[PDB]
Design a binder for this molecule. Structure first.
Ligand SMILES: Cc1nc2c(=O)[nH]c(=O)nc-2n(C[C@H](O)[C@H](O)[C@H](O)CO)c1C
Ligand SMILES: Cc1nc2c(=O)[nH]c(=O)nc-2n(C[C@H](O)[C@H](O)[C@H](O)CO)c1C
Ligand SMILES: Cc1nc2c(=O)[nH]c(=O)nc-2n(C[C@H](O)[C@H](O)[C@H](O)CO)c1C
Ligand SMILES: Cc1nc2c(=O)[nH]c(=O)nc-2n(C[C@H](O)[C@H](O)[C@H](O)CO)c1C
Ligand SMILES: Cc1nc2c(=O)[nH]c(=O)nc-2n(C[C@H](O)[C@H](O)[C@H](O)CO)c1C
Ligand SMILES: Cc1nc2c(=O)[nH]c(=O)nc-2n(C[C@H](O)[C@H](O)[C@H](O)CO)c1C
Ligand SMILES: Cc1nc2c(=O)[nH]c(=O)nc-2n(C[C@H](O)[C@H](O)[C@H](O)CO)c1C
Ligand SMILES: Cc1nc2c(=O)[nH]c(=O)nc-2n(C[C@H](O)[C@H](O)[C@H](O)CO)c1C
Ligand SMILES: Cc1nc2c(=O)[nH]c(=O)nc-2n(C[C@H](O)[C@H](O)[C@H](O)CO)c1C
Ligand SMILES: Cc1nc2c(=O)[nH]c(=O)nc-2n(C[C@H](O)[C@H](O)[C@H](O)CO)c1C
Ligand SMILES: [Cl-]
Ligand SMILES: [Cl-]
Ligand SMILES: [Cl-]
Ligand SMILES: [Cl-]
Ligand SMILES: [Cl-]
Ligand SMILES: [Cl-]
Ligand SMILES: [Cl-]
Ligand SMILES: [Cl-]
Ligand SMILES: [Cl-]
Ligand SMILES: [Cl-]
Ligand SMILES: [Cl-]
Ligand SMILES: [Cl-]
Ligand SMILES: [Cl-]
Ligand SMILES: [Cl-]
Ligand SMILES: [Cl-]
Ligand SMILES: [Cl-]
Ligand SMILES: [Cl-]
Ligand SMILES: [Cl-]
Ligand SMILES: [Cl-]
Ligand SMILES: [Cl-]
Ligand SMILES: [Cl-]
Ligand SMILES: [Cl-]
Ligand SMILES: [Cl-]
Ligand SMILES: [Cl-]
Ligand SMILES: [Cl-]
Ligand SMILES: [Cl-]
Ligand SMILES: [Cl-]
Ligand SMILES: [Cl-]
Ligand SMILES: [Cl-]
Ligand SMILES: [Cl-]
Ligand SMILES: [Cl-]
Ligand SMILES: [Cl-]
Lengths: 154, 153, 152, 152, 152, 154, 152, 153, 152, 152
């Protein structure tokens, strides 16, 4: 059959510089995600002296923070952490839609991959069930995408 | 285990200049938000003469006002206040979605943080229960993101 | 304590452009009638108003773009009505027409009053037509003066 | 008030019209084009001034319409096609994205783009609207093309 | 009645195609890739002119596709993957955003991007569409690559 | 063509005895409905000495009241008035569904027509727009259905 | 593999049919009645054996149909009418309750009741279904009357 | 214009005997309702020894308990208390719909009014804001419908 | 704990089974019955102990099933058919009512009634489930019939 | 001040019947295991428990009806799980199974614990299975003693 050139994913974090932005709304979720995220990054070989962590009040403030960090081009990839948890109103949909749209835009316009670790759930229990796993996944996504972006960069 | 560099959030509002745009639809809600917002800003050290306040008819008119103020680059951070309360038709979704989108886009394209304090609720009672708290929250958001923006500049 | 810019409703000397979508034409006509009446109440000269019409709400965006780009108008107004039928097209037209109106205002600096109703029944549109038209005139006059206020 | 009113202009003589037809649910798009071409000729659009291109589906409309609008050889463009709901959320995705691309093209290039993409739940709904919609898009293109020149 | 009709061109000879496969629900993306590659070869695309990349999830498709489109080494791109509803609103977010990014890349770079990301409620739905959607994307990338060349 | 026997509607209220049950939740709506209902009944010829009016707190209490009145068989028809107005919760659907189901059941099981004048709306404005018209319609429905039930009774 | 199969019987000779027509959105119920009566006659139902009653709305169908079923003068009943969505949740209430009453009467009296009450969002939908549903109800009442007799 | 006979509602609770069934799911809510309900009943003249109170695990178990009490015909009226708070799944609709339906059917088939004081809300905060008020409302409903039932008997 | 466990019994020997097939979307109901009869014979149900009746639509199921259950000639009944969503709310009405009638019959007569009425959005969904569902209803009827006797 | 009947959890001497639906069998088995374990903790003798199984949630109603009608049980328990798939059948089975359980309890006076999960994902069912089974045992024991308390 057809056999094209397949770029193999690269999960080696050695030498990578990673920036993390953590929303503090429903802060216990952000904390659990960050803990699991750092643990995984170190497991992938990311030096702890090469990781910066910043926090913002809520998920709507992620975009402006991530935008500045990507503009500096000091980071091979960024990570957004936080949790939008549904309350009583339509504001759940507004914050979920807008935070994701900002994250997606930053990666597209600056070339810096941004892992989206922002949960958008109905209950505190759903956020707790996903916090630790989501943090670790974001660490793997940031390492893999930093390396893929480098591979596609001349 | 791992221990990276942590930027501790800074809420010192001394010397900041803040701009506020308040939509007047369901005016009582925006008024309660604005009173709480100014009261909180003073609590964080923002000078009275360091704050400008503007008002627009509705939430859809916010975007153009916030844009003009941010482009001047006279403000470290901005705040949008107001309330969209559902009526009988899909217009509630239209105004809620568009107002929020304009706020987010302004902060992204100018680098000036914009706290989104526009409620999007089904009933007047829900808006009442959230007005004062949200206005205070936006003051803390603008001061903190203003400091964070400069640190990253 | 702080600086407060007071709303300015003096429409004297303002140049206002209005774009009316003709779908469900009865609604747009009632809005335009109430809108022109209101503008004159604010002091807008009849000679300072240009009115154009387009087939539907999706055609509003391209029309308002050209008019705002000329910068011959201090503010614009969009009139019309999307009324739900049998299919999802209602959401599409409501979402997109609003997004275009919002985008033009942000990108050109010229305020655009959104007078496009997004309703389920003819009756809902009829109940809101005359009001919304007058509201748009007040929004355009206030936001037009407002825009000049923040400029040099 | 008798403000300056730009009367809509439906004279198609001398206009260059481009058409992009999505072929998913092909019967619908073909009925739309058959009615569209009939109407354009009725309004005076020369057969030699119309080009017709086709694409597999509604999501491919944006790239094709963008290239033709960028050539600035066309006074206005027309998008034909039909999204018909199936079993999954992809119906909302294709409906939203195709309309957003059409709108964005018209705002950014100044070339009006008639939106003749139906977004329906059933084959029957698409069949009821196809021929009427195609004719409607022809009238939207001629009117908006003449309108764009007036403001240019 | 008798205008210029551009005929679709499905000849894949000489074309260079880039493919990005989201690995979430990996079996689906892999089945799509098999049918896509087999169909590209059926259409005459040389295996030496196809590059394949993979990413963790559909939200990472944008940054990968954007980089490939920027290089301008490819006549068309293909996005493969599957969003499958779980328990939360994250399904809508990933469906909406991935589609919006794919659409945006094609419009702003001129490189057609076939959108083969499924957005379904069940695993069974994704499986039923996997192979058919992969081959459809092969035909879409070839046809639109040839169409883009025609309007250049 | 086919020409069957068509029973002509009869709107003569003379000699009819009508019972009304008014829910007081969002009381201004019930009041407007009752006023318009009485006016219309008198216009149809219903003697005011032949009409009884009772009220209950809310629409969920309509069923038990209407059930007793229908059981006495002192009434040729009954009328339910009131308004369920949506608030913040699913209780709007529960009260709307259940009040209508009770009204419908009473008519089916006792043979006494029950006009359903209970509005189920999203806003106070929608209830106000419909109060007076709905009250009058219920008066016409009770008169017509009392007469139709008599016609079908041997 | 080879069981007892009861064949449907559409012979309307000798049958007595009762019809209740809700008059809300009256044009719809009247169009249903015309097609229903014409189809009953086509099926052999004698006009002298059909009684027609009308009621204000679909919620009054239950009490009228219940009285007719109690008399046991009819081999089958037919309910005609149309619920058309307005602005509020009352559309669901009347759709649900009228259908539930019709269904309940047939189960507890043994008299089949054809349910020809439409529950639609637009006037156009009701019009498109009116005549077809009326005749369908004629065939349903005749066939089920004959089936009910078979199992007695 | 027209002037028919008007039965003025009567809220005299003297001599009434009331039965209450309280579901314990989200127990704090039912407790606040029950405290308000008993307090209101005394305000309307119901004797302490004239009230029986029973509790069941959840709202679905109400129906069987309310039925047994109503069939005894020892009570002039009954009250159902509790709260269904939405979680992650469709079970919220199932319990809300079925619990309410059982309450309505009991009042219809026995002639004993049953006040429905079972909240059906999305959040714990909504249940909290409504507990005390609803419990008081149910006391007034049971007393008034109890008097109305006897007047029509 | 080893409580008394009644083992499900699937021996169809000696059972009398009644079947009612709605004919709306007839291809579906016929595929359901073809699989159903195959399975019943597999479990040992004699061909001479099965009667098959048909009705126009799912709303007519309740009256027919009620009469057959009331005869007490059948150990269990089977309802076949398919409601396929169209353009309006009538899909929810027919789905809800048909299922409620089937359930009510089984509770009130003690005759188990297998519910093999599909409630789907598309023709394709009905075709995917028809044959499997028909076989499933055969096994439900035999097991529940034997189960009813054990508790009788 | 008033009379308060205290909940009684002493299960000694109670006779409990359990009906387990086998659809998504893993869930029902985990519920039954946790339920039997809990019942013994309350003092229910193993010899006083009968357990029966049915194919699906819709078959629960007829089974519980026969068991409650014998009055050999102080309370019953229904176990099982409805898990959403691709179609509306999820709502139908969830609504009807609950309605039957509620109706049996009201009409026979015997409490019935509703242990039927109505969830969207397998994971939601797995997270709730063991819990709900134990909860049902406490509900049946408490409500069984409760039912005797209100009787002579
Ligand atoms: C209801 C709400 N929920 C969340 C949430 O779940 N997660 C989150 O990060 N932020 C939430 N917010 C606040 C907005 O994200 C934002 O910080 C404010 O509107 C201030 O601009 C709000 C208002
Ligand atoms: C119906 C409506 N509702 C609100 C609302 O709830 N909150 C708000 O801030 N503004 C509302 N508006 C006004 C629109 O945002 C806008 O001002 C007009 O559509 C055009 O000026 C309108 C028109
Ligand atoms: C169905 C429809 N409805 C409306 C409406 O309710 N309000 C409105 O202003 N326009 C409507 N249109 C027309 C579209 O806006 C547009 O003109 C067509 O899609 C053709 O480009 C259409 C096609
Ligand atoms: C399922 C589907 N449905 C439609 C439709 O109803 N209308 C339409 O115009 N196109 C449809 N498509 C095709 C997509 O727009 C597109 O071609 C694919 O996602 C591949 O890029 C698809 C794939
Ligand atoms: C919940 C989820 N579901 C899917 C899915 O169904 N299909 C898919 O392709 N990707 C999914 N993702 C992953 C996001 O696209 C993304 O990788 C994460 O948010 C990490 O950035 C997530 C997070
Ligand atoms: C929210 C609510 N709304 C209404 C309403 O709009 N109309 C009405 O008549 N009653 C309402 N209720 C109360 C219930 O109908 C009922 O009276 C209580 O639950 C007491 O049993 C409630 C709880
Ligand atoms: C709003 C409404 N809509 C309809 C409809 O669309 N079709 C119909 O047949 N009946 C409707 N009704 C009337 C109710 O069935 C009923 O007559 C009133 O509630 C008076 O009892 C009402 C009230
Ligand atoms: C999830 C759940 N939620 C509630 C609730 O919000 N309110 C309530 O009163 N009961 C709840 N229940 C319990 C059920 O009503 C019932 O007790 C079980 O399904 C069977 O005993 C359950 C199981
Ligand atoms: C539109 C429609 N759809 C279906 C369907 O999808 N499945 C089905 O079994 N029956 C359908 N019916 C027929 C109705 O059940 C019924 O026969 C009519 O309302 C006339 O009584 C109708 C009328
Ligand atoms: C699709 C389906 N899903 C479930 C489910 O999730 N849980 C359950 O208990 N039963 C299910 N069933 C089976 C029905 O309850 C029933 O057995 C069939 O409709 C055959 O009568 C069916 C058919
Ligand atoms: Cl984007
Ligand atoms: Cl999980
Ligand atoms: Cl944005
Ligand atoms: Cl800007
Ligand atoms: Cl940017
Ligand atoms: Cl509301
Ligand atoms: Cl709150
Ligand atoms: Cl915008
Ligand atoms: Cl209004
Ligand atoms: Cl622009
Ligand atoms: Cl049409
Ligand atoms: Cl290559
Ligand atoms: Cl785009
Ligand atoms: Cl780009
Ligand atoms: Cl462009
Ligand atoms: Cl398929
Ligand atoms: Cl009923
Ligand atoms: Cl009205
Ligand atoms: Cl006769
Ligand atoms: Cl029924
Ligand atoms: Cl009856
Ligand atoms: Cl029966
Ligand atoms: Cl049709
Ligand atoms: Cl009831
Ligand atoms: Cl009872
Ligand atoms: Cl009764
Ligand atoms: Cl919630
Ligand atoms: Cl409240
Ligand atoms: Cl029973
Ligand atoms: Cl399947
Ligand atoms: Cl019940
Ligand atoms: Cl849980």
């Amino acid at each position: 059959h057809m056999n094209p050139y397949i770029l193999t994913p690269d999960l080696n974090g050695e030498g990578l510089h990673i920036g993390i932005v953590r929303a503090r709304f429903n802060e216990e979720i952000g904390q659990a995600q960050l803990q699991a995220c750092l643990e995984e990054l170190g497991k992938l070989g990311v030096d702890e002296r090469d990781v910066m962590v910043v926090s913002v009040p809520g998920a709507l403030e992620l975009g402006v923070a991530l935008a500045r960090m990507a503009e500096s081009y000091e980071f091979d990839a960024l990570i957004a952490l936080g949790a939008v948890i549904r309350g009583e109103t339509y504001h759940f949909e507004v914050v979920s839609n807008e935070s994701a749209a900002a994250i997606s835009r930053i990666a597209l316009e600056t070339g810096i991959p941004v892992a989206n670790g922002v949960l958008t759930v109905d209950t505190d229990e759903q956020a707790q069930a996903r916090a630790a796993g989501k943090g670790a996944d974001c660490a793997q996504v940031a390492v893999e995408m930093a390396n893929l972006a480098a591979a596609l960069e001349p």
